[PDB]
């Protein structure tokens, strides 16, 4: 049995158990992935590799993660591109920016990426996003075209509290977001 756990309730200026990429940085109290600037990428990873499945027993991990995030757009109706929690190989580096959320490269399924992501997408990208043009939550598997999505109404400057969980027995990944 292997267990990995952690809790960060408030971020410190030196936050050594995270790995920063792109413009990712912490301050007193929060982790800023991107500032409100055009054409930028911020990523932040947890330091330690996580054992998520074992080829020898065939077992898969049950996991649960939860976080509070804020999106702050200065033009409230012109918002892009989004935020994702992702799971990727240990050596993961920033992928394509903009509508690719720093985690993918393609709107086609790519076995080489080995990345599952849960997106909170704020910008409609005609080439792959829901035709209904709504901002959305989505489950991405080796592609920026999500396998499933849900429309979500953004609350600018408001704290979303998210819980994501994965059940090893059924293989269902559950996502919930809540605003107060």
């Amino acid at each position: 049995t292997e267990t990995t756990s952690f809790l960060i309730t408030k971020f410190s200026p030196d936050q050594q158990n995270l790995i920063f990429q792109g413009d990712g940085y912490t301050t007193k109290e929060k982790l800023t992935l991107t500032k409100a600037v055009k054409n930028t990428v911020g990523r932040a990873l947890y330091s330690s590799p996580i054992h998520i499945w074992d080829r020898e027993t065939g077992n898969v991990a049950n996991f649960v993660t939860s976080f509070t995030f804020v999106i702050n757009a200065p033009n409230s109706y012109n918002v892009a591109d989004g935020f994702t929690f992702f799971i990727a190989p240990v050596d993961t580096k920033p992928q394509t920016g903009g509508g690719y959320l720093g985690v993918f490269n393609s709107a086609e399924y790519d076995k080489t990426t080995e990345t599952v992501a849960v997106e909170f997408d704020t910008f409609y990208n005609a080439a792959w996003d829901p035709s209904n043009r709504d901002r959305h939550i989505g489950i991405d598997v080796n592609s920026i075209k999500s396998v499933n999505t849900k429309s979500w109404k953004l609350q600018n400057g408001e704290e979303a509290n998210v819980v994501i969980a994965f059940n090893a027995a059924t293989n269902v990944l559950t996502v919930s977001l809540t605003y107060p």
Binding site: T1, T3, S5, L7, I8, T9, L18, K30, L31, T32, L33, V37, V41, A44, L45, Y46, P49, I50, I52, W53, D54, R55, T57, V60, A61, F63, V64, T65, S66, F67, F69, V70, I71, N72, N78, V79, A80, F83, T84, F85, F86, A88, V90, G97, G98, E114, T115, I139, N142, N148, T149, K150, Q155, E159, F166, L173, T174, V175, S176, Y179
Partner: protein, 49 residues
Amino acid sequence: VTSYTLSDVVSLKDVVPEWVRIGFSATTGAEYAAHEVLSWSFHSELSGT
């Protein structure tokens, strides 16, 4: 209290490797916003059956 929920079947074993790193990413392009995290917690467990 506005709550949203999405749920699907992801067979992790066939997509990601045995060992992984997890994290957050946020991007901007021609349009932009600040993206920020306030708290984070994670717990996972794997059997040795």
